[PDB]
Amino acid sequence: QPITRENFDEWMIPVYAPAPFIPVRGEGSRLWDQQGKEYIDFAGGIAVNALGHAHPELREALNEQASKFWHTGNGYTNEPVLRLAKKLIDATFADRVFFCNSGAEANEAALKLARKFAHDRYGSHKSGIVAFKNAFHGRTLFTVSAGGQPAYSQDFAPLPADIRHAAYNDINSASALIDDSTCAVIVEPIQGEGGVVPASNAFLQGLRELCNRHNALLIFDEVQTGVGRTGELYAYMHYGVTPDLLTTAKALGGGFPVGALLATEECARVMTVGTHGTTYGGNPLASAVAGKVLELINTPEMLNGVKQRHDWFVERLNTINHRYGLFSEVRGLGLLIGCVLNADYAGQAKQISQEAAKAGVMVLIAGGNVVRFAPALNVSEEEVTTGLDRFAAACEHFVS
Amino acid sequence: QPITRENFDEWMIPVYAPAPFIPVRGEGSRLWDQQGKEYIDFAGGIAVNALGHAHPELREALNEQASKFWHTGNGYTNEPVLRLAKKLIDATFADRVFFCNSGAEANEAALKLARKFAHDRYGSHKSGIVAFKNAFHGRTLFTVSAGGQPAYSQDFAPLPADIRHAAYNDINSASALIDDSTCAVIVEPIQGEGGVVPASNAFLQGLRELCNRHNALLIFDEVQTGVGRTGELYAYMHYGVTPDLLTTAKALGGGFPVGALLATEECARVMTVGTHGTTYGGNPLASAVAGKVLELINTPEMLNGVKQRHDWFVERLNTINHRYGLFSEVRGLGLLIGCVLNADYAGQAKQISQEAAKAGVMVLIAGGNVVRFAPALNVSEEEVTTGLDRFAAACEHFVS
Ligand SMILES: Cc1ncc(COP(=O)(O)O)c(CNCCC[C@H](NC(=O)CCC(=O)O)C(=O)O)c1O
Numbered sequence: 098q099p100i101t102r103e104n105f106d107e108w109m110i111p112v113y114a115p116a117p118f119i120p121v122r123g124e125g126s127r128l129w130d131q132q133g134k135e136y137i138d139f140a141g142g143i144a145v146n147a148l149g150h151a152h153p154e155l156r157e158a159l160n161e162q163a164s165k166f167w168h169t170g171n172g173y174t175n176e177p178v179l180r181l182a183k184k185l186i187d188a189t190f191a192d193r194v195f196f197c198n199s200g201a202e203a204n205e206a207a208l209k210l211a212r213k214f215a216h217d218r219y220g221s222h223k224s225g226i227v228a229f230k231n232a233f234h235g236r237t238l239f240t241v242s243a244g245g246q247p248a249y250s251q252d253f254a255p256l257p258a259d260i261r262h263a264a265y266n267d268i269n270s271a272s273a274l275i276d277d278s279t280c281a282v283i284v285e286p287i288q289g290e291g292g293v294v295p296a297s298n299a300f301l302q303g304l305r306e307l308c309n310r311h312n313a314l315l316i317f318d319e320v321q322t323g324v325g326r327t328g329e330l331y332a333y334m335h336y337g338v339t340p341d342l343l344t345t346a347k348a349l350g351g352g353f354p355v356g357a358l359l360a361t362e363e364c365a366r367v368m369t370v371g372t373h374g375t376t377y378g379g380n381p382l383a384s385a386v387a388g389k390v391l392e393l394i395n396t397p398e399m400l401n402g403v404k405q406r407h408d409w410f411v412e413r414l415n416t417i418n419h420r421y422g423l424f425s426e427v428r429g430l431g432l433l434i435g436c437v438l439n440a441d442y443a444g445q446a447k448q449i450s451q452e453a454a455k456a457g458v459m460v461l462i463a464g465g466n467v468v469r470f471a472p473a474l475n476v477s478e479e480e481v482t483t484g485l486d487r488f489a490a491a492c493e494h495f496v497s
Numbered sequence: 498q499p500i501t502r503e504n505f506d507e508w509m510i511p512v513y514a515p516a517p518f519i520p521v522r523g524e525g526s527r528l529w530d531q532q533g534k535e536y537i538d539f540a541g542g543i544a545v546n547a548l549g550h551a552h553p554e555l556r557e558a559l560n561e562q563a564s565k566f567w568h569t570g571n572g573y574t575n576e577p578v579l580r581l582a583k584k585l586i587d588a589t590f591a592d593r594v595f596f597c598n599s600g601a602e603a604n605e606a607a608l609k610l611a612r613k614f615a616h617d618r619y620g621s622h623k624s625g626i627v628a629f630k631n632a633f634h635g636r637t638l639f640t641v642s643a644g645g646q647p648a649y650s651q652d653f654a655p656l657p658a659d660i661r662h663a664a665y666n667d668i669n670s671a672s673a674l675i676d677d678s679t680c681a682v683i684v685e686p687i688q689g690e691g692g693v694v695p696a697s698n699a700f701l702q703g704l705r706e707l708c709n710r711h712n713a714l715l716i717f718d719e720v721q722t723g724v725g726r727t728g729e730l731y732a733y734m735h736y737g738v739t740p741d742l743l744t745t746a747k748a749l750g751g752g753f754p755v756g757a758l759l760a761t762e763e764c765a766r767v768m769t770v771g772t773h774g775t776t777y778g779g780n781p782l783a784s785a786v787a788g789k790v791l792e793l794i795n796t797p798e799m800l801n802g803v804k805q806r807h808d809w810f811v812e813r814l815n816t817i818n819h820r821y822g823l824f825s826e827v828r829g830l831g832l833l834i835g836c837v838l839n840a841d842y843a844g845q846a847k848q849i850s851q852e853a854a855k856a857g858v859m860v861l862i863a864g865g866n867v868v869r870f871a872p873a874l875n876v877s878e879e880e881v882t883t884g885l886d887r888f889a890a891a892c893e894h895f896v897s
């Protein structure tokens with residue numbers, strides 16, 4: 098049977114308003130819809146497709162593991178998860194890992210661990226979580242309660258207790274809510290969804306000192322910011338501040354559902370048998386693919402190529418903006434970039450984005466005031482230039 | 498990179514104790530480890546691998562979609578999700594579906610939906626969830642609080658509030674906790690993890706009556722009992738009692754990570770734009786696979802096949818039990834089967850499950866007193882007999 102966009106509004110729980118067109122296939126940073134229209138993809142499946150669409154090596158790893166076995170569940174380990182655990186361990190501060198299937202799942206694990214850890218070493222009452230206004234951490238009750246966007250949490254109250262929000266990049270705000278009762282401080286190194294806003298180096302370093310003083314675990318939510326996105330493997334390396342726990346997802350599987358929690362030995366020791374779990378996490382399908390992703394992403398060449406591409410993007414966006422007077426700022430790190438709208442245009446991020454799509458380029462928002470770019474890490478100069486060309490046309494169309 | 502079982506104990510957060518051997522490939526209901534030892538697999542990936550290991554048609558569906566595109570995020574829908582939704586909608590009470598990555602995310606979506614519906618139609622005071630002791634609903638903070646194993650949640654307190662547990666199969670225990678402050682009652686049609694305990698028809702009609710009297714959503718957690726498992730497509734069809742929400746995962750994806758919330762038009766209307774969502778949820782790879790799974794399982798020959806298979810397993814577990822007197826009962830429905838231990842062997846299901854791995858058959862537990870069988874719905878007659886012969890041999894060693 099034949100499928101059309103109107104089918105989405107009769108069949109799907111109305112949680113999203115997706116685009117009027119329906120993608121059917123893609124290669125690298127180009128995607129095509131059911132009528133053959135071609136888009137340059139700067140959405141990057143919301144910062145996931147780090148190698149672009151239908152990558153041939155990802156496919157080959159996919160179809161090679163798929164012809165062995167896909168899944169047993171965690172009664173049994175497998176070679177792919179173990180290899181991926183090693184890669185991740187060797188490449189980061191981590192001594193151990195847990196695999197799950199989403200960014201939120203990864204965050205659930207991390208907040209669960211810090212909680213058990215605090216209880217087990219200090220007592221039932223050291224249960225506080227500090228997070229940040231505008232943070233986004235997931236849509237599970239706990240993660241969305243840790244998130245600092247109350248419009249996402251209010252309807253599903255009572256919310257789990259002992260969660261407080263401080264102002265991002267505001268060290269005294271944080272200091273005031275962090276004490277001996279705090280078990281965890283969870284933070285994104287760049288707030289993604291809340292408008293591509295990068296932590297300051299003194300802010301992050303400041304939470305690290307606060308966590309030490311109060312015996313609280315510091316947790317980096319790198320589901321958006323990780324696996325190459327900033328030009329280092331993880332943004333913590335860019336800042337030079339090391340967390341107790343790090344969560345990772347999205348790009349980890351370059352399009353396959355996977356997530357993981359990276360922990361130190363000491364922290365890991367806290368989670369004994371049967372204290373957490375997941376049916377699908379650690380499957381060898383996900384693991385063969387993530388493994389090949391890390392193998393391709395975590396190379397001096399690919400990562401420097403991200404620093405290179407950051408400059409191509411910002412430079413052309415600054416030139417677009419000079420011509421059209423749209424934004425007050427282009428900010429971010431690596432290939433997570435925000436264009437902040439000016440006073441004239443504020444709250445119109447989505448309309449620009451819809452224009453973009455009309456002009457054959459896919460971009461994201463990040464709040465109604467930021468247009469956001471999260472392209473593949475291996476976008477070609479040609480793809481960037483022609484996508485920015487069409488962005489430029491959309492900006493013309495929009496500004497009149 | 499060489500990989501051995503001792504590596505697990507150094508690389509993984511020690512949340513599982515898995516088998517001392519490592520599977521590396523499978524076909525239908527046989528699996529093989531790194532040294533070529535062979536198993537009959539009656540664990541089924543814990544009730545996931547409804548079509549067994551490395552199924553030709555599921556790989557063809559994987560590879561086919563894999564070569565077009567994997568993922569965009571939900572800013573854009575796709576044809577396989579929409580196809581999948583339509584199949585779910587056509588085959589059940591549901592009018593609309595939401596897609597995510599795991600049974601726990603399914604249960605988040607359903608619990609969240611019940612709460613918002615209550616709040617909107619009656620006031621934010623109506624937040625009560627009623628669950629059952631020994632229930633298992635997932636490892637997110639909210640879902641492990643809905644679940645009835647306090648051991649799995651206590652370490653992570655404070656827990657989201659307003660959750661009560663009644664007694665499974667005891668309509669009076671339910672009745673005493675469900676009132677007009679109740680938003681949701683969530684129940685497994687067979688308690689899975691907690692002992693393979695089937696619900697009676699009266700207990701289920703009772704909750705439906707009681708949910709109608711008090712305006713609470715009745716939620717059937719069909720993540721284990723779903724997708725052909727019981728002999729019908731979903732258990733609720735066996736029992737003739739219709740839920741307001743139905744969650745589903747495991748076998749839905751044949752091994753691919755997928756899950757879903759199934760809802761009526763009424764309840765689906767409640768989730769408006771931006772109120773929930775997931776990065777990976779509803780990607781076209783998952784969707785193409787589940788799509789195939791539904792096609793291959795929702796037929797009269799498989800589902801009848803599952804009734805026929807139930808018979809093989811039970812004629813034979815009786816025979817074995819005659820010889821070794823191990824079990825006070827054999828219970829469950831279709832291909833979810835619990836063998837309950839006698840008081841002389843109480844707490845030794847795991848020991849049994851180990852001796853069976855040594856004998857080359859994989860079986861599950863479901864608490865210390867049940868050996869659980871969750872084989873592929875397409876297991877063959879030869880594969881059932883061979884795996885029971887080895888389960889019989891294992892039973893012999895265990896008894897002496
Ligand atoms: C920094 C950060 N941490 C955690 C998570 C949670 O990851 P999941 O893998 O999604 O569990 C995220 C992910 N958030 C991306 C927002 C995804 C959804 N948005 C859309 O579908 C956009 C739809 C549209 O544009 O119409 C959502 O859940 O709201 C993260 O970034």
Ligand SMILES: Cc1ncc(COP(=O)(O)O)c(CNCCC[C@H](NC(=O)CCC(=O)O)C(=O)O)c1O
Binds near residue numbers: 172374375377513721
């Ligand atoms: C009825 C029911 N509802 C929900 C869920 C949650 O599904 P996920 O898809 O896991 O989020 C389940 C799932 N559970 C089967 C047990 C899952 C884990 N088991 C193991 O890791 C086995 C370990 C071993 O045997 O050594 C777990 O969380 O513990 C469900 O059944």
